């Protein structure tokens, strides 16, 4: 299977302007009739190359004439000798029941539904399956009325009829041209939650949420988030929905989280269904963020789409930025920034040093579904955010407005978007564009000096990005580098030079650069890379006291958290080295004291305190090291937890009790208090065993909501408390019939620190709530084991690797997209010690040998073995 390259992009030889589809639907054999109006733009001798995969062709007509000038090759139907304008009619057959890959048209339970992004439409009919070809669709669907009473596609119901033999049809029309990745079709039986939203100019939009029969009780939060999403986009971006109806369908069987199909989003039911006894605060916030995300794509993705798939970030990075701003405006900005930065430094950095490293705009791709990445999404968004940081809100909004004014109704490029921001703002973003073409994480090194004779503070900032597996050449970037300088009272010193204010966002554009500030009347404590102003590794020689001083005085709550992370980092590294030498945890009294002060500070926002009291995950810890020792990291997180539990037991308990809430509310202050309370519980679980066991069992049984129940159950597993097996058994007995709820329990099993966890995971393949046919169940058991239990996954006997090989040998054939997400842990072999690396390499070599190796895996494996 061969790589496509971004610099090979060329405009298509043909366009399609309109497509009329008819689906005679049936799970065994669906007959598809596609009538496209087409226009030749290239040369007469150039043929029309239509993509198609696993299609049985029935016939080809050109202006109603049966066509003899064509041939089928691998993945294509090539048609010659066409006039300039013509009508193409294709009839073909497909088989949804056989589609275990869940790409194109497939079954989810008794429903039929689609997934077309990136290149799924070509599994439905022969088409120009590329996103610079935009067409107006009309979709007629014919099906059995009893199995499929709801027949849905994009746009508005414009026709309908009854047929003989219990069949009926419905025809839909969507007036906006679209690329085919945004086609959807759903056929099934559903309960439907109906509501409306009136836009700010007065358009009444009908909202419809389709869920499986029985689940209407879990739907109102998603509807409420949808309305909140529509409203925020109006207030913040000035954007209104542009259709009459907005449908979302919740399906249980989905490779993805959710998909923005125009006017008919299809969502994984994990991002829709919530009730207080089944869903945590985190699930509610996620539903809100994901509903918003797909909604935001209506502009940033649909009204302006992507010229080609190498431009994916144009929509996903910008739309992530949007969903982050939405969550942040509605909730706690600081908590959002904090967690997004956790993801960046702990997962996206790992990617950007792995064999799969790529720029946010890739240059080379073999399987495009492999590039829906942490890089494209999260670093993508950080790149948008830097543009925002350089321009300010007002200018950023002007650039958004110019982007739409220019590109509404067409497919654009990343470079188009940058250009609009540049032209609208008059900020020069030439050098800035290098963030789109250069992979890897820059290292920004800072040295300082205070001169008391001249009252000048001097910052010497330098950058470099190391070579990555994909690129040997690197150059300096335009790094927006935000600073604040604090005096000995905790006040900000005005930034100035030669009697003029200076912007506090410094433009770090060279390999090495000095900035000098004047009238710095006291030696400053600096806050550097404020709010993570660029997605870079900061190297600065902090003292502990500088960091604790920032924990106390920094203006932005993010910086208080960040200082505390820098404070811990030094001691995480210390203690991992110690653990390798068989030594126990060492932690200075003054560090413990800094955390005691956060617990007992009565002015601190509880939401902030909770994050400072949530230790960096094993993944964030892992990025502090060149070579990763996953067992030492896991053990050091546990020991650091046990030591703060002991040092802070009385304060932990007091704060636990003080934050008790009798009423459960999905409201930001309540969530903050609850998050702090459960953070204290976590520590307490690792303290004195009998208290631990009592607190945890009691919270589990008395909880009036799943947040509090799961925090307890999870602490029981994490600390291996006596009550653990009984609580786990109870949860299963109550919840086994509910897949989404069981996902959490599978995650807990998979991430257990118990010595026999692998054996338990193998056995859970036979559990009544588990099935290899369901991507969620697979992600929750196997994915969680491999990706989120690195200690057990990297057991020295290599048992973890052999297990993953066995699961991937199945999934490579069954559902390559899922297999590909699951292989990610194995491709990080170069970060491990030689012996682990040998075993991971043999594992990869074995998968490389599979018969019918999917392209999705092939891409990753060959990069990993290079």
């Amino acid at each position: 299977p061969q790589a496509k390259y971004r610099h090979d992009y060329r405009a298509p030889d043909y366009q399609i302007t309109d497509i009329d589809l008819t689906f005679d639907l049936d799970a065994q054999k669906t007959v598809v009739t596609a009538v496209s109006q087409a226009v030749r733009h290239g040369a007469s001798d150039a043929p029309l190359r239509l993509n198609g995969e696993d299609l049985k062709l029935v016939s080809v007509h050109i202006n109603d004439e049966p066509w003899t000038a064509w041939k089928e090759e691998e993945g294509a139907l090539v048609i010659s000798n066409l006039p300039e304008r013509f009508t193409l009619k294709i009839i073909n057959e497909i088989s949804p029941a056989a589609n275990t890959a869940l790409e194109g048209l497939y079954q989810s339970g008794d429903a039929l539904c689609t997934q077309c992004e990136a290149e799924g439409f070509r599994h439905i009919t022969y088409y120009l399956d590329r996103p610079d070809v935009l067409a107006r669709f009309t979709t007629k669907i014919i099906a059995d009325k009893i199995k499929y009473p709801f027949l849905l596609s994009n746009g508005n119901r414009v026709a309908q009829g009854e047929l003989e033999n219990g069949r009926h049809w419905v025809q839909w029309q969507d007036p906006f041209p679209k690329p085919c990745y945004l086609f959807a079709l759903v056929a099934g039986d559903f309960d439907v939650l109906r509501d409306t939203f009136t836009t700010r100019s007065g358009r009444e939009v009908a909202l419809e949420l389709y869920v499986d029969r029985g689940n209407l009780d879990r739907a109102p939060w998603a509807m409420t988030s949808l309305k909140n999403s529509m409203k925020w986009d109006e207030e913040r971006f000035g954007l209104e929905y542009d259709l009459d109806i907005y449908m979302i369908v919740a399906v249980d069987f989905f490779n993805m989280g959710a998909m923005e199909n125009k006017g008919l989003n299809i969502f994984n039911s994990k991002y829709v269904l919530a009730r207080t006894d089944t869903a945590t605060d985190k699930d509610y916030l996620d539903i809100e963020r994901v509903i918003g995300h797909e909604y935001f794509h209506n502009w940033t993705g649909n009204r302006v789409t992507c010229r080609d798939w190498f431009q994916l970030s144009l929509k996903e990075g910008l739309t992530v930025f949007r969903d982050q701003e939405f969550s942040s405006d509605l909730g706690s900005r600081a908590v959002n920034r904090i967690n997004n930065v956790r993801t960046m430094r702990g997962l996206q950095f790992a990617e950007d040093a792995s064999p799969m490293a790529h720029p946010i705009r890739p240059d080379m791709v073999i399987e495009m579904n492999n590039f829906y990445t942490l890089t494209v999404y999260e670093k993508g968004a950080e790149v948008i955010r830097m543009i925002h940081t350089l321009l300010g809100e007002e200018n950023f909004q002007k650039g958004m407005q110019l982007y739409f004014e220019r590109h509404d109704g067409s497919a654009a490029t990343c470079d188009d978007f940058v250009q609009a921001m540049e032209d609208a703002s008059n900020v020069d973003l030439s050098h800035f564009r290098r963030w789109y073409s250069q992979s890897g994480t820059p290292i920004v090194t800072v040295k300082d000096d205070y001169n008391p004779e001249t009252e000048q503070y001097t910052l010497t900032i330098s950058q470099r990005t190391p070579a990555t597996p994909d690129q040997a050449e690197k150059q300096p970037l335009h790094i927006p580098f935000a600073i604040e300088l604090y005096d000995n009272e905790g006040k900000v010193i005005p930034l100035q030079k030669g009697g003029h204010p200076v912007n506090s966002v410094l433009n770090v554009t060279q390999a090495e650069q000095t900035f000098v500030f004047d009238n710095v009347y006291f030696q400053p404590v600096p806050a550097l890379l404020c709010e993570f102003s660029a997605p870079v590794k900061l190297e600065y020689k902090w003292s502990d006291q500088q960091l604790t001083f920032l924990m106390r005085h920094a203006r932005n709550d993010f910086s208080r958290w960040d200082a505390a992370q820098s404070l811990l980092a030094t001691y995480i590294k210390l203690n991992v080295a110690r653990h390798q030498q068989g030594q126990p945890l060492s932690l200075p009294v003054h560090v413990a004291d800094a955390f005691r002060a956060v617990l007992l500070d009565e002015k601190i926002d509880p939401a902030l305190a909770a994050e400072i009291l949530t230790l960096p995950s094993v993944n964030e810890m892992a990025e502090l090291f060149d070579i990763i020792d996953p067992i030492a990291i896991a053990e050091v997180r546990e020991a650091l937890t046990r030591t703060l539990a002991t040092e802070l037991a009385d304060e932990l308990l007091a704060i636990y009790n003080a934050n008790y809430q009798s009423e459960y509310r999905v409201e930001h202050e309540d969530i903050a208090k609850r998050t702090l309370r459960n953070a204290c519980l976590r520590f307490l679980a690792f303290g004195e065993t009998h208290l631990a066991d009592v607190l945890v069992s009691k919270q589990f049984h008395e909880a009036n909501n799943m947040t509090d129940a799961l925090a307890a159950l999870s602490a029981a597993v994490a600390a291996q408390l006596p009550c653990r097996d009984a609580l786990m058994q109870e949860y299963d007995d109550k919840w086994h019939q509910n897949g989404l709820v069981m996902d959490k329990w599978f995650i807990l099993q998979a991430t257990s620190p118990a010595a026999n966890v692998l054996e338990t995971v193998r056995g859970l393949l036979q559990h009544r709530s588990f099935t290899m046919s369901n991507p969620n169940r697979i992600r929750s058991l196997i994915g969680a084991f491999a990706g989120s239990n690195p200690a057990a996954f990297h057991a020295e006997d290599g048992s973890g690797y052999l297990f993953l090989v066995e699961m991937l040998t199945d999934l490579n054939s069954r559902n390559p997209q899922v297999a590909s997400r699951l292989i990610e842990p194995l491709i990080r072999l170069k970060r491990y010690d030689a012996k682990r690396q040998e075993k991971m390499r043999a594992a990869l070599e074995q998968l490389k040998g599979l018969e019918n190796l999917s392209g999705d895996l092939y891409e990753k494996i060959t990069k990993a073995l290079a």
Binding site: E117, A118, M256, G257, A258, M259, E260, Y271, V290, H293, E294, L312, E316, Y372, Y377, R779, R821
Partner: peptide, 4 residues
Amino acid sequence: XVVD
């Protein structure tokens, strides 16, 4: 797209 949200992937996971």
